[PDB]
Design an enzyme around this catalytic site. Structure first.
Site, PDB file in Angstrom:
ATOM      1  N   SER A   1     -37.023  43.428 -12.697  1.00  0.00           N
ATOM      2  CA  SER A   1     -38.397  43.608 -12.204  1.00  0.00           C
ATOM      3  C   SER A   1     -38.745  42.628 -11.100  1.00  0.00           C
ATOM      4  O   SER A   1     -39.792  42.778 -10.444  1.00  0.00           O
ATOM      5  CB  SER A   1     -39.413  43.432 -13.313  1.00  0.00           C
ATOM      6  OG  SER A   1     -39.316  42.130 -13.876  1.00  0.00           O
ATOM      7  N   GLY A   2     -37.921  41.597 -10.935  1.00  0.00           N
ATOM      8  CA  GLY A   2     -38.223  40.510  -9.998  1.00  0.00           C
ATOM      9  C   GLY A   2     -39.353  39.566 -10.420  1.00  0.00           C
ATOM     10  O   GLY A   2     -39.873  38.826  -9.579  1.00  0.00           O
TER      11      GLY A   2
ATOM     12  N   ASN B   1     -50.693  31.387 -13.310  1.00  0.00           N
ATOM     13  CA  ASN B   1     -51.060  32.686 -13.889  1.00  0.00           C
ATOM     14  C   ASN B   1     -52.552  33.034 -13.687  1.00  0.00           C
ATOM     15  O   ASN B   1     -52.874  34.124 -13.221  1.00  0.00           O
ATOM     16  CB  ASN B   1     -50.724  32.709 -15.386  1.00  0.00           C
ATOM     17  CG  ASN B   1     -50.443  34.121 -15.921  1.00  0.00           C
ATOM     18  OD1 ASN B   1     -50.536  35.127 -15.202  1.00  0.00           O
ATOM     19  ND2 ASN B   1     -50.066  34.189 -17.193  1.00  0.00           N
TER      20      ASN B   1
ATOM     21  N   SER C   1     -49.655  41.376 -11.924  1.00  0.00           N
ATOM     22  CA  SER C   1     -48.630  41.447 -12.982  1.00  0.00           C
ATOM     23  C   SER C   1     -47.243  41.275 -12.314  1.00  0.00           C
ATOM     24  O   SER C   1     -47.147  41.326 -11.091  1.00  0.00           O
ATOM     25  CB  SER C   1     -48.768  42.820 -13.682  1.00  0.00           C
ATOM     26  OG  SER C   1     -47.526  43.409 -14.054  1.00  0.00           O
TER      27      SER C   1
ATOM     28  N   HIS D   1     -11.793  67.206  20.924  1.00  0.00           N
ATOM     29  CA  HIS D   1     -10.596  67.009  20.052  1.00  0.00           C
ATOM     30  C   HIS D   1      -9.667  65.892  20.549  1.00  0.00           C
ATOM     31  O   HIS D   1      -8.496  65.843  20.124  1.00  0.00           O
ATOM     32  CB  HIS D   1      -9.748  68.296  19.894  1.00  0.00           C
ATOM     33  CG  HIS D   1     -10.536  69.535  19.573  1.00  0.00           C
ATOM     34  ND1 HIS D   1     -10.598  70.070  18.298  1.00  0.00           N
ATOM     35  CD2 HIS D   1     -11.202  70.401  20.378  1.00  0.00           C
ATOM     36  CE1 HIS D   1     -11.329  71.170  18.329  1.00  0.00           C
ATOM     37  NE2 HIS D   1     -11.692  71.398  19.582  1.00  0.00           N
TER      38      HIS D   1
ATOM     39  N   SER E   1      -6.968  36.332  22.575  1.00  0.00           N
ATOM     40  CA  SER E   1      -5.656  36.007  21.995  1.00  0.00           C
ATOM     41  C   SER E   1      -5.144  34.632  22.419  1.00  0.00           C
ATOM     42  O   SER E   1      -5.296  34.220  23.571  1.00  0.00           O
ATOM     43  CB  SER E   1      -4.613  37.078  22.376  1.00  0.00           C
ATOM     44  OG  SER E   1      -3.328  36.833  21.801  1.00  0.00           O
TER      45      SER E   1
ATOM     46  N   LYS F   1      -5.863  38.234  27.573  1.00  0.00           N
ATOM     47  CA  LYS F   1      -6.369  39.409  26.903  1.00  0.00           C
ATOM     48  C   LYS F   1      -7.840  39.231  26.548  1.00  0.00           C
ATOM     49  O   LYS F   1      -8.272  38.162  26.086  1.00  0.00           O
ATOM     50  CB  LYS F   1      -5.545  39.736  25.643  1.00  0.00           C
ATOM     51  CG  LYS F   1      -5.627  41.202  25.231  1.00  0.00           C
ATOM     52  CD  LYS F   1      -4.518  41.556  24.190  1.00  0.00           C
ATOM     53  CE  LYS F   1      -4.764  42.913  23.493  1.00  0.00           C
ATOM     54  NZ  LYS F   1      -5.764  42.806  22.376  1.00  0.00           N
ATOM     55  N   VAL F   2      -8.605  40.285  26.790  1.00  0.00           N
ATOM     56  CA  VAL F   2     -10.007  40.319  26.379  1.00  0.00           C
ATOM     57  C   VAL F   2     -10.296  41.600  25.602  1.00  0.00           C
ATOM     58  O   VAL F   2      -9.901  42.675  26.018  1.00  0.00           O
ATOM     59  CB  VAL F   2     -10.946  40.263  27.592  1.00  0.00           C
ATOM     60  CG1 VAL F   2     -12.392  40.473  27.131  1.00  0.00           C
ATOM     61  CG2 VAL F   2     -10.736  38.940  28.373  1.00  0.00           C
TER      62      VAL F   2
ATOM     63  N   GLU G   1     -16.860  45.991  18.006  1.00  0.00           N
ATOM     64  CA  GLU G   1     -16.352  45.683  16.697  1.00  0.00           C
ATOM     65  C   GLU G   1     -17.423  45.164  15.729  1.00  0.00           C
ATOM     66  O   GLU G   1     -17.490  45.632  14.609  1.00  0.00           O
ATOM     67  CB  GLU G   1     -15.138  44.731  16.774  1.00  0.00           C
ATOM     68  CG  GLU G   1     -13.890  45.306  17.439  1.00  0.00           C
ATOM     69  CD  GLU G   1     -12.935  44.232  18.049  1.00  0.00           C
ATOM     70  OE1 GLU G   1     -13.025  43.029  17.702  1.00  0.00           O
ATOM     71  OE2 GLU G   1     -12.053  44.620  18.836  1.00  0.00           O
TER      72      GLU G   1
END
Lengths: 454, 456, 415, 458
Positions: free
Chosen positions: A93-94, A126, A134, A183, A313, A319-320, A326
């Protein structure tokens, strides 16, 4: 340094109390990464703020009310996050988080009014902080406030940035003609502008979908009390608290027209998760497309030049990689799993109360945040700097067999068959065969005339 | 309060009180997705410290200077031991190979190793992040290696021991309740008798089988990608390196790590993670059932089923089955996490699956939740459960299921007449048998014996 | 008895009692995946009938001979009306554009139209499957169009009327039970009072909200791809065809179909199906809760909750006197679990578009139609064989009030 | 029509059907989803096997051998797929599958009565419950039929389909063992690997799928029969559980055993969740393989063009759609959604009985059969005919800027990166750039940069 509350030791530097210590002892599931998400806590701030002000109508002393209001604002403003140690994996109920909030607002209010921390004097968690409320109706109220704020502040602005960036690119690329792929196979021409316009429509529609899934998020359970009847709350509280939340947030919160439905199920969170799920599918396609269209630089598709932000790398020198595609496609995958978690919780309500609430809101906020933030990152760090490799594209147009059809209403198949077999261009072949001149081919075959109905 | 560092893209300010470097600063700038709760999980970080420790020792066979190796081994140990966690700010939502975390690790270890050697932080001297810390490795083969190490340690140290507590506690309870007869429920309707022990034995079996299922899904987690380098060929690594590092990792952890027999499969896919997540998904189904049953069986006190008295550890005088809630929530989360893993696993491209961070996040999340939840449910619920025998006994005496016991003693038609009559009048079988005149209370007690209704 | 047709790979026997042809036969051989339960859903085939009927009438504007178009319209109508279901043997697990089903349709309609005009079956004369039946169309824009027509029709005729009946019966029961005061349960623990009418009003709100959700998830389902041709450009189709075909389908069905404003988005993704599936997914969550509650509330006859008396739908057992199994509750909750799975299948297909064309099309519509139909039919079955027959055990509900530890008539609202 | 009776009124039963009044009422009360939703034939056949086994065993427990013999025969007809038309019921029935159990008992009763020369619909001399259902419950028979059906489908359909695909991929791997292609990581041009090495990865994934499925089978061999209503075995005979499992083991040639805990066997179907789990892993593997082959065969001229896939369609000249890749990837997506269905059902057992059984086994069988058939079709119609475009492969590989990785141990990372960036700015070869840069001779480049040396470790 500790104080005794009641029979529990509470750190002198914390605003929570015995019931929060009590809850930490028995729910040690997953540790601190699993702590109740901040937006839930902040949303509780807004709730307790709203309730305290409204409660002056129902005998709440304005001095106490004002101190609670101030303490709650501090909560709502993220100034007291270190005072919330409870995990998502608590009572379903949290209520334990509700008590946490009450205790912290009580002790900050008490401090503000010069009382002793832990005393419940003159602000009782309370009797004052939870007045008219509640467990059952408060956590779901906070959930919805938190979800709506996250959608309006994070999710939708992220998507909007993405939509706008894609639309700019679509316009920028409107005259760049490339080969369609259906395709994965070579197919008839379209512009890069046309293809990108597809991505724009999907993000426009993602935003429409999320907006469509909000109306029932704006329904608040506050006023249902224990089982939905409103037992032990005052007449008018439900409505006045919704309205105060609306005015504090500038969002159209209203009391739930059926509190039983509002407490026994969280179908609106499942609905909202569903919209984020569709959005994840759209973004998976867009980011994966752009990933592949940017591939190479030499031995892939090579149509797009994506901004280079960092090295790819330690071994392969220079390399890029399309690292924003991603993070985005990973986020899309996460959102789809999050949705199943939300669905399983949503489906598992018992009688008057669904007790999977914390887990459902954890997943909804996670999806919304990831999607919003990824959409900005992807936009700023990829989309806006995308350039077309027009050299490559132009070469690939002139080397494709898909344009042979333009010659049909001039000479009448063999070109394409021979070009395909010989490895040569349509133009080269048409001339080698002696069916037309180099000047003729250029006259007949005009890809800019192959981009619509005739 | 900053120093200046460099990578191949250029120069960046790094905070003086941080061991990371330029590429980590760069990642923080480019991957602002989700914030601090989204940081790379600590088990992956520690696992990387184990791996780099392993690599650095083995690399002495391939030239790495002992002075440099030793320093690297000591730094990496502090990473493995959770001493340097504040030097890792990067999120899960980064490059899909986990390269940026690899570089974070290379940088943090390089700098701690330099400091141990009284060099200048950020100088790459005498311990270079690439040439020394990352010697013979790639992001592509190291991040999968760290994942499986992380996964295996979490299964062995958290998940399985959690499930073992729960198995043993349920089984003790099964034994304790062996003589208590209650009404079985099928379709939620009153069925025929079984003991509370028998019912609990089903849960024991489910947990035993969860453990067997997890263990069954572990063999391919023990296969390490290290040695595949960029695309799985081992380009730029010496022969033997794959096997030596896998063995060193085994010796460092006490777990049966071995080299992946096919490095293409190991880089291109994370099917082993999908397999393990699958076992946890089954385990989550088993646990959902157990914990939901225990929740319902403890329902009441008065208008529920009321068969079990669950420990009262906090206030709801209301008190609720709060451990059953935590546990059934965890179970639901595992199922979602499993779909996230499956979508990531399904989406490899050519020589590299680039969903790695997200996949291991979910697997680790599921393993820790299931393990922790199992301990909590055991200690804070299962071990304290009592049978409400006065309630169970009263429900037995009021059930209509026992009337078939009277068949051979009075005939089927009289036996049927009683059940029908007690059903219409709201009375016990015994009351109605006696009222109809078919038998005495003494005959009813000798004839209807639920302990004889418990087996073939 | 068979006839002989040919395709680019060989001769084929086509049974002389079938209206399909060479391409369909070849597809039956090359996609032997799963069996008869895996056949393309009848609603998709019917939606093709409507589409090919619309295209044929519209193509008279673009040179299609009226006598050919009228035969095609007639033959298409028989497809749409479900008179030719046996001439479609193809499974869901074909090409991802659903090309083979479009070809199936074209062949069937060709040969039925040929027969009406008095020609030879298998001949392509005088009605050619590609040149006439497929005129102005691509497989790439026809299958999506048929999917959306099928989904909307299934939503309108089956799913929404099913849920409407359920809403109405639950509401009837909410009213009937409005004065019966029972013990609320929170965390499964005894709680404060509510009426059985109040509890049932929750269920009524859920179903009302389900129908709302489903309608909210329809607007983009009404968008049709027809006219986008191979990649979205409308190359090789005629100007105005897209709009005319959508308008004809809208008039044919009485649903508000429109041409998709962006054809690239229409071909490259099926985000509308994912959206519609998401609404069915929420609905499944609602129904799971309603049906499971009714299940538990009907539990007994003496060791459960026993608040509801559910209608008997099975023979009684002598070994278990008074046991009445909640059979429709079980049917519905299985259906609910099924829709949740189907939704994940739709999501994965949806997420996996490539460039100009999403090729997960057949499985995405199969799951959508499966979920829609199961939800609609289960909603009607649960209504007629459970909900309308529900009774309350007022003696036990009440007795469990004077027994509760929690005037109860004065505890049902705020003070 | 014949007239038959149940507790809710008079029912017409077609004379040409072997089912009875309970089956007819079920067709009326569970009108959910239509004909495609009929209970899977493997379940029906598996019940045939179980009722055959039960009849033979029950001759130890009072069953007249005359009656038993006729029940065995009728049950064999069900098990052999000769009576499929007499099972009209859907999956969406009671969650225990009781109506299908009833369907099977009615059918076997009536076909047995006809073999004995009695009246159809009379329950004389073969009673559907007293004889065909002797020693059984609805609650232990459906799970037993589920596991027999699942086990048979795995052995006869799924594993043989995967085996074929494994062998075809392994053949192609060997065929392509000397073709040097460019690796792609992040979709970006990378260092070489052979086409055989790339395909060896697919081969390993299918090998492991088969291992995973077999590892997920042991608890499927566990049979619930003898558990009766709640697991206790009340109202059955001692040794029935063991004897029926052995007879099922003997009839099928599979290592079926009695479930050691009947409460677990009836209250949960965790083994189906486990098996579905293995198929879900398998689907991820097939998704990757089929997607790769799709992309690798892209073209003719604006894709990668490394593979030439077989033509499965009529002829955009040169366009060859990867049709089987599409069927396989759709199937893989379906197995993933089915796994969620199975999981939700399996999570939701109550007390002594999980009442999601028909749905759970439908999804498991659907996934096993689609995976098995798709693997066969993918093998036969794609994998066996795959050819390499060796000319295009070679050019794509030779053009990779990341061949400069070769120069690392000779001239260092930094100078290799300058070679690469300036080759990419200029549009030059790696060799043209390194000679111009003063970093290497033409001859040192040729001896340092040799793709055939980059295929394994030093």
């Amino acid at each position: 340094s500790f104080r005794i509350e009641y029979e529990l030791k509470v750190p002198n530097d914390k605003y929570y109390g015995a019931q929060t210590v009590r809850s930490t002892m028995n729910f040690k599931i997953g540790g601190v990464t699993e702590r109740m998400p901040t937006p839930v806590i902040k949303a509780f701030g807004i709730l307790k703020r709203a309730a305290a002000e409204v409660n002056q109508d129902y005998g709440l002393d304005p001095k106490i009310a004002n101190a609670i209001m101030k303490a709650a604002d501090e909560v709502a403003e993220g100034k007291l996050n270190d005072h919330f140690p409870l995990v998502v994996w608590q009572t379903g109920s949290g209520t334990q988080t509700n008590m946490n909030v009450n205790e912290v607002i009580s002790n900050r209010a008490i401090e503000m009014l010069g009382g002793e921390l832990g005393s419940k004097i003159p602000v009782h968690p309370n009797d004052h902080v939870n007045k008219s409320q509640s467990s059952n109706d408060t956590f779901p109220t906070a959930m919805h406030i938190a979800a709506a704020i996250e959608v309006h502040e994070v999710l939708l602005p992220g998507l909007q940035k993405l939509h706008d960036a894609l639309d700019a690119k679509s316009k920028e690329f409107a005259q760049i003609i490339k080969i369609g792929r259906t395709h994965t196979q070579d197919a008839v021409p379209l512009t890069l502008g046309q293809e990108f316009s597809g991505y724009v429509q999907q993000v426009k529609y993602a935003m429409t979908r999320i907006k469509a899934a909000m109306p029932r998020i704006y329904e608040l359970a506050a006023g249902g009390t224990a089982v939905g009847t409103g037992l032990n709350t005052r007449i008018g509280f439900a409505e006045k608290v919704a309205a105060k939340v609306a005015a504090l947030t500038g969002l159209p919160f209203v009391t739930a027209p059926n509190k039983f439905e509002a407490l026994a199920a969280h179908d609106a969170l499942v609905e909202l998760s569903g919209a984020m799920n569709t959005t994840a599918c759209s973004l998976m396609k867009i980011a994966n497309d752009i990933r592949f269209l940017g591939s190479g630089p030499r031995s892939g598709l090579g149509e797009l030049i994506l901004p280079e932000n960092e090295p790819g790398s330690s071994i392969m020198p220079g390399k890029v990689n399309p690292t924003q595609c991603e993070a985005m496609t990973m986020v899309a995958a996460q959102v789809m799993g999050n949705h199943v978690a939300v669905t399983v919780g949503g489906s598992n309500g018992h009688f008057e109360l669904n007790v999977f609430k914390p887990m459902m809101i954890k997943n909804v906020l996670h999806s919304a945040r990831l999607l919003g933030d990824a959409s900005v990152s992807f936009t700023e760090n990829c989309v806006v700097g995308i350039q077309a490799n027009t050299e490559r594209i132009n070469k690939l147009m002139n080397e494709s067999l898909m344009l042979v059809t333009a010659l049909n209403p001039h000479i009448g198949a063999k070109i394409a068959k021979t070009a395909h077999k010989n490895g040569s261009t349509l133009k080269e072949t048409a001339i080698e065969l002696g069916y037309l001149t180099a000047e003729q081919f250029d006259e007949w075959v005009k890809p800019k005339d192959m981009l619509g109905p005739k």
